[PDB]
Design a protein around this ligand. Structure first.
Ligand SMILES: [Cu+2]
Ligand SMILES: [Cu+2]
Ligand SMILES: [Cu+2]
Ligand SMILES: [Cu+2]
Ligand SMILES: [Cu+2]
Ligand SMILES: [Cu+2]
Ligand SMILES: [Cu+2]
Ligand SMILES: [Cu+2]
Ligand SMILES: [Cu+2]
Ligand SMILES: [Cu+2]
Ligand SMILES: [Cu+2]
Ligand SMILES: [Cu+2]
Ligand SMILES: [Cu+2]
Lengths: 270, 271, 270
């Protein structure tokens, strides 16, 4: 695998928010998508631009305690400080004893572990979360990737009834990364589309018995993802995704997957 | 791939509830079981007999936005109004891009999307939900199918501690369709029986690594199903199923899977 | 296909608790680990030493209604009474209808079903739960097994912020049994390690599409397990496990998987 180096910044944002960015003043919630192939090493030159301690902690990937991002393992970052975190990944294969070592590939996420509490409750609430995708050799690559985070009662820390919306063309291969944070369980639902409940969100072939779903229960720090063919067997349209917990959809935990015809039109909606 | 047609009616019942039915005054909660084979197209000639806007929205199956059953897609039904909803299904197969297209087959459900709120909160609460099963070629068919819906704190909108109960005989292949709605997470548990956490609820063979379970966390609009051999390795008896969230079972989210001997008898129990 | 016999006692414990034990005055919370191979029968000579009715109910395994442990089937135990419960297990096999009968193998649990309520709400709250593992022929056996029960807001009925901690050496094959009870949903997370969402928690091979996860939503009476190679690809250290529901980790639903180097030392303990 390849050795990669990136910079990452934690920054305070308007309305008491906090975000990660690849450049100063370009912090976003969710944070930037990090994509790796199994075997790749990533060195993250992390700068905490804030006035409180902050950290970077990742799910799924290989890291040593020196890159835990915790007070326990003295790997958080002082205010205005810098730390180089290292994430490693590995491909699957048989061990010496004939057991199968699972690879790093999957839909994962990174977040703060020290803002507000020693579990990053305040950091997470304020927006310090982002997606990580680790791909296996031969994995099907998409035309676009969209990240949806159910953070307490908000989506991507947007005000209620505020999307986000995602645009595609009929036939586009669209990947979704779906992360949950905070206090509450949710159920993720997408109209007119469906996926497999497995590593890639896609059945491997006819021997894969994974349930095909369009609704999934998720809790804090769950991550999954999938790919769909936009509008496959259903056509162009305003295709809602929403939390299916009835009070949550009613309070505006809803967005649109806007699937246009090749001619740029979409069947008239609202 | 057969093209089929049914009539469906939304009706107000007693205790203010609301139900789907195949005939006028025959509405049930849950709604009627709709069963399709992959490839089938179903045209639902729907009539809203109620004095409020209602709709039909489906999980899992192929439909165009004109059959969304939402206000967003101008697909709900005015009071007394009619609409033909079209559901399509497909078999699995190889795409030209070399990927495997997942089929429609599964345990699915349909429900209202406009009663009370633009997400059907009032309709779902009052009973406008029912099961849909899409079968793959070669799928094993059961002796009977039973639908269990955890709707907020009730089962099938029954009052607390009033079932439903389902009866079978030892050896019967019994299918359960398990749907959840409303506000709360649940855990579905059955005494004396277990199933696979996969598409059909049954392991394909010794090369299927799916967890074998008797307890499953479910949230609103989750659906799964399974088939068991009634009493297999455990015998006839009153086999409780219940939510395993302790306050929920204590409040009466409990029913009985009554498995009889081939002589029609059951070991004595005290409900 | 071994017939096994054990004695089990239900007893009141200090601090308003109740537990199962293999010997009088030796009750623990969780109760003793019961391990069976598919085909084994277990006869449990159960004695209720308490002043309230109590029972033994099991998930997953084969039992007749006479061993349900319920009020419904009159198979609980009066105060000071004794009853033999029988649990059976079976190997998988091909049915005469051509379908595959799922075996008993898996991560399971037993608990009371009649203390406090006819669903055992009081018994479970006070500590009457324990793990059951049923193995399939050829299953990989671990160096150690550790049971983590999320019981309402507690782990193993320990007071908040009280572990438990589990020690291993790098390269040990360590098995976790993860059981949930009570009123609340949880998300189980382990730093530095991951497992397969399937029967054994280990991918069978390259043909297994199971998601690889480090975070799993669980609710009352859910049970799963897995094995990890301690420190595999991540090294020695204090590896936190916790509930990832943020208020739960903040209130102390946390422990340590203490992974020692071959020499005995743990980095960050100097
Ligand atoms: Cu943590
Ligand atoms: Cu939600
Ligand atoms: Cu829907
Ligand atoms: Cu985390
Ligand atoms: Cu919807
Ligand atoms: Cu419940
Ligand atoms: Cu049980
Ligand atoms: Cu729905
Ligand atoms: Cu029970
Ligand atoms: Cu928790
Ligand atoms: Cu973590
Ligand atoms: Cu139980
Ligand atoms: Cu010390």
């Amino acid at each position: 695998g390849e050795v990669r180096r990136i910079k990452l910044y934690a920054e305070r944002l308007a309305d008491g928010q906090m975000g990660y960015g690849l450049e100063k003043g370009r912090a976003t919630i969710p944070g930037p998508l990090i994509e790796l192939n199994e075997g790749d090493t990533l060195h993250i030159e992390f700068e905490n631009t804030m006035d409180v301690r902050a950290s970077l902690h990742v799910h799924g990937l290989d890291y040593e305690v020196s890159s835990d991002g915790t007070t326990l393992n003295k790997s958080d970052v002082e205010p205005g400080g810098t730390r180089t975190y290292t994430w490693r990944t590995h491909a699957p294969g048989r061990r010496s004893d004939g057991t199968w070592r699972a690879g790093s590939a999957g839909y994962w996420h990174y977040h703060d572990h020290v803002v507000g509490t020693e579990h990053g409750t305040g950091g997470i609430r304020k927006g310090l979360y982002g997606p990580v995708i680790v791909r296996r050799k031969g994995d099907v690559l998409p035309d676009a990737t969209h990240t949806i985070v159910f953070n307490d009662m908000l989506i991507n820390n947007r005000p209620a009834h505020s999307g986000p919306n995602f645009e595609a063309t009929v036939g586009d291969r669209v990947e979704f990364v779906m992360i949950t944070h905070g206090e509450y369980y949710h159920t993720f639902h997408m109209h007119g589309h469906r996926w497999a409940d497995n590593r890639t969100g896609m059945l491997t072939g006819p021997d894969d018995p994974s349930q095909v779903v369009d609704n999934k229960i998720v809790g804090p720090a769950d991550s999954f993802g999938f790919q769909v063919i936009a509008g496959e067997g259903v056509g162009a349209g305003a295709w809602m995704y929403h939390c299916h917990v009835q009070s949550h959809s009613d309070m505006g935990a809803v967005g649109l997957f806007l699937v246009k015809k090749t001619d740029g039109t979409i069947p008239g909606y609202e």
